[model samples]
Target: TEYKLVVVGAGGVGKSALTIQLIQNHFVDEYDPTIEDSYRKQVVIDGETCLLDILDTAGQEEYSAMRDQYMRTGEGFLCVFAINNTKSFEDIHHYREQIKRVKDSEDVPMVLVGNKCDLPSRTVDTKQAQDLARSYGIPFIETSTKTRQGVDDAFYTLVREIRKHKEKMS
Candidate 1:
């Protein structure tokens, strides 16, 4: 009924854009940093009523390394990165490691997201990102929060993954 969905990745990867776009309908149109914004949205994902307790965390070093509390609490994660930024894509590895280490499990539910697809220019190759996601045993999604593309699908996929993980653990 409820999902503690956490979104993580490097700065300027459009995490807040994707999250705020998912919970709301419009884009923010700015680059203001989000320290942490907790939001809850009730919706129907694949015919199942779900409440999403979403945490959009900051991507600044000043707010570094306090992820244990969220990582331990989150049931699923959206590991986001911008296709235009190569550095942000590379940072995904760090996030994936910290997540699994904190969860103490290899089967943690997560998704690899490449955002800003609406931007004509891209630095992170699709095949590269896709291969990395496949190697990690997770789904890879390309999204544009600005265009509202794959926004719902991202969160929806995570909820489904969480359900699968929960069932397997049972």
Candidate 2:
């Protein structure tokens, strides 16, 4: 099966980090917003052959008009936010709502990702994120782009999610 996975988040939330980490197997510190980035790679997950086609979007209000264009093609979303950034955490709701509005499906497949788990001080707690994910009816995962914690699981979970949605859609 093939997948169109969207990497989503506000600026500086590791949207680029998660996408690149999955492919490069390394952390990406330097980043962007207005510039559109994507990648297509084949990988085996859960013994199933799946190719990931990912989109790293411009995470700005000014780009909202353009963001919708890409959302139309996303089969699943990995909405990431840095645990240290409370505003980025709050912005997840907007991205969630935008995805739903664009997909026109409340049950759209997605994974709520809390990035920057390596940071010592915290702003968005694990418990808080779990509740937010609960409200969205999506799965929640915490990750450290630096340490590589939860990176693979986050992506694989989205694949599993898209798989689940596919089965029930018909």
Candidate 3:
């Protein structure tokens, strides 16, 4: 697998919505939101195509077992949270550490995503978002699935980082 992309987050935080948005754009809106225990899709990103197997893990505590299985094969992770949920923003710390444990890799690519940025007033503090990502050693991005904003750039930035490092190694 060249790029095992995983879209993961707490439920109802627009993980599914973001995944669907990505699928709609990347796959011509022809997918059925289907996967036995997880929904997935492959995306060809310009000259650097990815094996984007979007994992739909259940969420939080219930998803530990399933998420561990996904992380074992993951190359990058998009950790999402609803923009308004402050606790969600704060809670991603656990998710980050959990990924480290499951993958046992310190340098795997990850992006801290604050989805639903289209709603301005209903949002957590931007500085908090930035601070969290900075502390965790990852990039941060805010996106709105409704406006289709920052959607491509979020995924593209991580893919580019991964590809750049891959080239350096070779």
Candidate 4:
């Protein structure tokens, strides 16, 4: 059983950066924000051979149409935001709406990821983030692409949800 995981977020929030780390530190030591979109591969926890088909679309509002198109094909989604940016956190609702409109499913499983967790001083209250996730009945995690913190666990949780949904359907 394979799963198609989508890494999504506003630009500069490190969607591609996280993908680099997940693909075994391809961009760990040397990170570049300019190199827009790049794809990576990995084997997930359930011992499944899966491709992390990362689509790093631009973060501008002008690209919202395209972003919606990219998200339409998602089997599972990771709506990533920056830990330091309150606006990024707030913007998650818009992302959710965009995805929900495309998928048009009420129970589509999703995970809300607040990236850049290593910056503790720049942190938003965890409960606030949790509340946001809870409001939508989705899981929330704070991660750092640079330190690889919470990165694996976030994806793992999503895959678990995907598997659970898959089993329920079967």
lDDT of 4: 0.75
**Residue range 6-98, candidate 1, lDDT tens digits:** 888876788777776775742223333453434433555555554444333453544756568778888899999999999889888988898
Cα lDDT for residue 162, model 2?
91
lDDT of 3 by residue, 54-113 (tens): 554454546355657777877778988888877677667777788888877777789989
C-alpha RMSD values across all candidates: 7.4, 7.3, 5.5, 7.2
Q: Rate the local accuracy (lDDT) of all candidates.
A: 0.79, 0.80, 0.75, 0.75
lDDT for each residue of candidate 4 in 1-170, tens digit (9 for 90 to 100): 56788887777788888776776732222244555644433455555444465545554555545665567777788888898888777777887887788888777778999899888666567888899899999899989977778988888888887888888889
- What global local distance difference test value does model 1 have? 0.79
| lDDT at 147, model 4 | 79
- TM-score of each prediction: 0.81, 0.81, 0.80, 0.80
Q: Residue 94 CA error for candidate 2 (Å)?
A: 0.6
Q: lDDT at 125 for candidate 1?
A: 89
Query: Which runs in model 4 stand beyond 4 Å of their true positions?
Result: 25-42, 55-65
* Residue clash pairs of candidate 4: none
- Order of quality (lDDT): 2, 1, 4, 3
